[PDB]
Each structure stands twice: as structure tokens, then as C-alpha cells.
Amino acid sequence: SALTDLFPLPIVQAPMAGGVSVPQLAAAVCEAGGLGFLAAGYKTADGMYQEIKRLRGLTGRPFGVNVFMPQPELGAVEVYAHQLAGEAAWYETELGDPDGGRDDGYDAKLAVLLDDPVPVVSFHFGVPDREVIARLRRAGTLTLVTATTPEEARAVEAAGADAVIAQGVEAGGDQGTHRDSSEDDGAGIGLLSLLAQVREAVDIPVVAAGGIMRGGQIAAVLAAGADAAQLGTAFLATDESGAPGPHKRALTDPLFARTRLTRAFTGRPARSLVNRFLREHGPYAPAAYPDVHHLTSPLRKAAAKAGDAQGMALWAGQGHRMARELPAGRLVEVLAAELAEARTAL
């Protein structure tokens, strides 16, 4: 597997937007034998390029860069904005523009990734045109795409990608569904089941994602057909993580004892710890991405500035309670040991 041949351990640090995946995090994972990732989501092409440059200065080992697929245009947003009037007033800020870009600098970002190739590139919220994948392949870049159902996985393979990321419902953060509709609500697939379905649906390598916090779980997905495990929440609380202090603390806080998928913050299903904002607006959030994300960004930044976890997008997978606060490099070592220990037992 070209992917696994790139790095020693079957461990991938999930790209996490919102200032989480700073170069220092990716670098530590890379130096420990795992695959570090940079998140291009919501950044400008230049912002992404600067991180890429900095990371190369921190490590010479393979790393990945994640990009968001452009979303098509399209009452609901006007109403939700109105319902947030109180949040804007309380945080003394203005809601963001729901009609901003929807491509997230896609064209410019691909230009950078093609002109100065990186080892790995993954896509979220859909599948790239097969010409984008072919061109990146020629450049020597391995391509990955997230799928949440066996059908989406088939689409990923059909596009010619090198590997598919099977993200189960337990996953923290944004669900990588290709198309969001109120019907998918309540129909999310558990990772162990999704992995098996995807493994029999496609022939390309599968990277398992969702709720993986221990080395034993990494051994579990490998046993079920995965080539590697992608972990987000586990690295979210490491020291190199750029996630706000209130967010890191919430992960193990008994007060935030539950997570759930919501469109409250971005307008697309994403798993977050249940808090005030989710409770109040979660039931009414419309399917409109990145429209809603633009709308609530000022709110989230204001909340983070104040240290108010109740107004933040507390992204977290179902294994958040097992999050460990230590250097990412040491976390990889611990994970590797747990993995070995589980293989031996099995």
C-alpha cells in the first residue's frame, strides 16, 4: 500500500480546522512515525502555503494537507440568522455574511498543491473531478477522500483516488458527507459496520476514522480491513494542538458528558459536546453549508475570546473522555505500544 509505505505506523493525525492542526502538531506526529496533517479549511491559499512551508522546515517526513470541496448554492438561513439575534447581542458582535464564498479558495489551493507538491492530499465534503486526482497523482501526490457510506466510497474509488477514509458516526467534527439532506438524519453508520461495508464495496486501501482513542481500537480497525487509523479528538488535546483551552478542557469535563451531531454551528452535521448553543439552536439549524458557518464564526470567536465553552463548537468524537493531555509525539508512542500489546493478545 503506497500510503502505508510512506510512514512506519498505521496512525494518521486527522486534519482539524479552526487553528487546531498547526505545523507543530503535524510535525510531532510525523517525527514519531505517524502521518501529520495540515488543515486548509477556511484558510486562504496563501495561509495554507505558509503552513506547508513552515512544516517542511520542521520535518522532512511525509505529511498531508486537507481541502474542502466547493459547495453548490442553496428562507431557512434568514430565519436561523434571526434566531441568533440574541447571541449576536449577548456576544456584542455582528453575525457573519451567509453569502460569502463557497469554494473556500479551491482553485487557488489546488494551484499551490500542484505547483509545489506535498506527499498527501485529502478532500472533505465530496469527491474531486477525476482530472484533479489524475493531475495530483502525476505530481506524485497520494490522494484520499472521506466517505460515510459504501456508496460514497464507490464514488471515491471511481474518481481514481488512492485511498478512501471511512468516517463513522462516532467521529468528532464535520461529517464528510458528499451531499447533506435532512434524510441522512438518524441514519449514520457505526465505524465497525461502515469499515466492513466499505472494504467489500471497493478495492482501494481504507483509512478508518471515528472514536479511535486507544491502540487496541487501532488493532480493531486493522483486523476489520483498514490499512490505517485516522485520529482527530485524540490529538486535539495534545500540547501541540492549537485548540482553545476551553475546548481541550471540555473533552474530559464531566459536565459535558455527551456529544451529538448538529448543524447548529456550520449548517452541516458535525459532532460536538452538547452545550448551551447546541441545546438552544441545534433543533432548528438548517442544512446550509458553509452559509451557517459564516454566520456563526463571529459568535464562536467572541465566545472563545471570553473563554465561554458554552458558545463554542466543541468538536469531539464519542471517545473524547479518553483524551490524554501530553505531547503528540508521546501520544503516538503510547498508541504504538497499545497497538503492539493488542496484536500480541489477538
Ligand X SMILES: Cc1cc2nc3c(=O)[nH]c(=O)nc-3n(C[C@H](O)[C@H](O)[C@H](O)COP(=O)(O)O)c2cc1C
Specify whether the CB–CB gap between 98 and 288 falls below 8 A: yes
Stretch that binds a copy of itself, among 87-95, 108-116, 218-226, 327-335 (CB under 8 A): 218-226
Lookup: cell for 263: 448543524
Stretch that binds a copy of itself, among 58-66, 97-105, 112-120, 205-213 (CB under 8 A): 205-213
Specify whether the CB–CB gap between 86 and 281 falls below 8 A: no
Stretch that binds a copy of itself, among 34-42, 59-67, 159-167, 257-265 (CB under 8 A): 257-265
Cα-Cα-Cα-Cα dihedral sign, residues 167, 168, 174, 179:
positive
- Letters for 157-196 (x = contact with a copy of itself by CB under 8 A, - = none) are -----------xxx---------------xx-xxxxxx-x
By beta-carbon proximity to a copy of itself, the closer residue of 249 and 321 is: 321
Cα(318)–Cα(258) distance, integer angstroms: 8
SS3 labels along 51-63: HHHHHHHHCCCCE
CA distances from 325 to 214, 249, 254 (A): 14, 10, 16
233 is in an annotated binding site: yes
Specify whether the CB–CB gap between 25 and 18 falls below 8 A: no
Residues 6+ apart with CB under 8 A from 279: none
Cα(137)–Cα(140) distance, integer angstroms: 5
| Among the listed residues 43, 61, 109, 124, the single contact to ligand X using CB under 6 A | 124
| Among the listed residues 97, 103, 200, 325, the single contact to a copy of itself using CB under 8 A | 200
- Letters for 300-319 (x = contact with a copy of itself by CB under 8 A, - = none) are -----------------xxx
- Letters for 196-215 (x = contact with ligand X by CB under 6 A, - = none) are -------------xxxx---
Residue 219 CB, nearest approach to a copy of itself (Å): 4
- Letters for 40-79 (x = contact with ligand X by CB under 6 A, - = none) are -x------------------------x-------------
Q: Which residue has the cell 460514497?
A: 152
Residue 243 CB, nearest approach to ligand X (Å): 6
